[model samples]
Target: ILRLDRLRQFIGELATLLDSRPDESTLLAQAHPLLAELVHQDDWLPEDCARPDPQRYQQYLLHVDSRQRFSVVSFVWGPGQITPVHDHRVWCLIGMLRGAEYSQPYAFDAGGRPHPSGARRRLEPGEVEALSPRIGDVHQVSNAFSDRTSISIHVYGANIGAVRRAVFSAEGEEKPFISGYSNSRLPNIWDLSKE
Candidate 1:
């Protein structure tokens, strides 16, 4: 569990970092340690490792902070289910609370072709990782161990509901703003990763 004082410090420091510069990678690099500690906190994890019931995903609320330019998201993923490969042009913070999952990062080639290459890493109880919006920013996430589900918390620099998000297939193809939840069709597999 994260102490309120600690969490507030993390948020304050992150906000200050953004307010001071536009270089996301540098800012994210600074935030890595703080974010990692938050994820490793015992208060963040709530349940045993089990597949997420569909209802769990639907029931969560993503709190948006327009004034602070940040939003909080807590989502549960079923075993082996992976989020479409995506990029957040905006700054981001992630914390894994329960179960174990892996992240596969990607990049674009000189020809503007997207590359699927990446490293796989797992987060276990009390472990945390901070990612900078740099060459390694875009990624695919899934529960590496299929026997259980994973729940993660994310904080974004912009209103995720308002900003355009993408889902890529393989390397070269990407689907941008496939749809907004309220104004457009929600994003899904298939065409999300269009070139």
Candidate 2:
């Protein structure tokens, strides 16, 4: 019961924060801490929502606002899984829960080409990171653990699966891509209840 209450309270604060439509930096500054707190438990997500794909990282939609303001998702990464280089069209935050993630950030040229910014970091459990369009958001993420699965919770400024974002090739060729969630049935805020 206490777990459910903590989840509910965190969701409520997140909803209120998104409703304000704050600036990109503020959104990250405010929401990242909230998510860091909310995702304290490795099992914050329901069992069904934490499903992983052997071939790739899987995204499970946890909450999508009725007004399309913001969305929460859980990303489950199997061993050796990685993502194509991509840039988000919205501000985003990632909170690590179960394992580790390595992020390789990129720098875009004047002609809109991507180059490795040469800064790479690995996130441990309970750590949070932010990616914002205003501050160069192109990057690739992968599970740091090669022998086990990793799970991270994400909050995006929009319904991430529906956002027409861009994916990049090694040579920096950009292609429009929309990564749909693995689960066809998304859960509502109340569905997080642990009864």
Candidate 3:
């Protein structure tokens, strides 16, 4: 079914939302349900963009709005893969597309060790979640199943792969790293010939 038009429409709608120059809260709120719908449809993502890596999770950039206002990407998790506790300085929205994932929120202690601060969440397919510094941005995510791959579509206020991000240890150690995308080629969302 891989209907690229659905993904194209999503990009256009999000661009309109960004054009409004809404604040972080407004951006997240309006984008939340729309993203939920996008991933729920599940027929727009091509298989090439959803392949899981054996060594680690793969982050594949789908689109970045003009002027760098926001970017969308797909996160593919191999079985037993989990992200280190981390924070995204910009606001984010995540919508699950396949399988399930566990999101565990954490808070750093005075001694720099991170501790669980809220209820751990399991995001089933078709569900959505929002994140920001204002809300809880620090968390770890993992595939719920150890035998299969899990995929989620994520939206970020900035070009996430280019942004300087960090991974935190349980001891609160921070290692700065820039995450480049897994694929050099985009999903060809602009091609009319294919349709």
Candidate 4:
């Protein structure tokens, strides 16, 4: 618990915030810094959560609030891997913890297909970005480095793994998906007994 104090405090305070039942905007505004602060301490993440796959990216669950108001996950990106255009149906905070990633927002065309709506931007370590329906939600992301691994921590308003979401083809055709966590056993960071 001591070694995980930073993460512990984050979970504690974030729970307090969630308990108050703030609006989506308030939650995103207030929680952004907390996520930024957690990623600032790069060494606290478990070894398993940081592991990258050779064939794809990995999403490792770290914690799930008992009330299901929030969940913490770590995304491991192998070099050169990229996500197809997708959207999170709920609010989310993505904090860069290692390496770098490029994100591009999308907009649908007359063809009813998604296309890169803006220039792809790079997110370096220590930066945090928010996404929601109000703020652009559809985007594609990738590991900026082709030679090494990158990682980012994500905080979602719900059980993202169970939140039915979608991925779009270049033609804007959509396919629903449920991104289950890469790790089967949920790891604990707030267990006071471990202190």
Who wins the lDDT comparison?
Answer: 3
Scored by lDDT, model 1 comes in at 0.60
lDDT, candidate 4, 42-123, per-residue tens: 8688887889999889999988989888889999999999999999988989999999999999988888799888888899
lDDT by residue (1-195, candidate 3, tens digit) is: 568887888889988988999998999899888888788877889889999999999999999987888899999999989898888988999999999999999988789888999999999999999999899888999999999999999999899999898889877789998888999998878888878
The CA lDDT at 156 in model 2 is: 86
**Model 4 vs truth, CA RMSD:** 1.6
Per-candidate total of colliding backbone pairs: 13, 0, 0, 0
Model 2 stretches with alpha carbons more than 4 Å out: 188-194
Model 4 lowest lDDT segment of ten: 1-10
**TM-scores for every predicted model:** 0.68, 0.91, 0.97, 0.94
For each candidate, C-alpha RMSD in Å?
9.6, 2.1, 1.0, 1.6
Better of 2 and 3 by lDDT: 3
Per-model C-alpha lDDT, please? 0.60, 0.83, 0.90, 0.89
Model 2 pairs whose backbones collide: none
Residue pairs clashing in model 3 are none
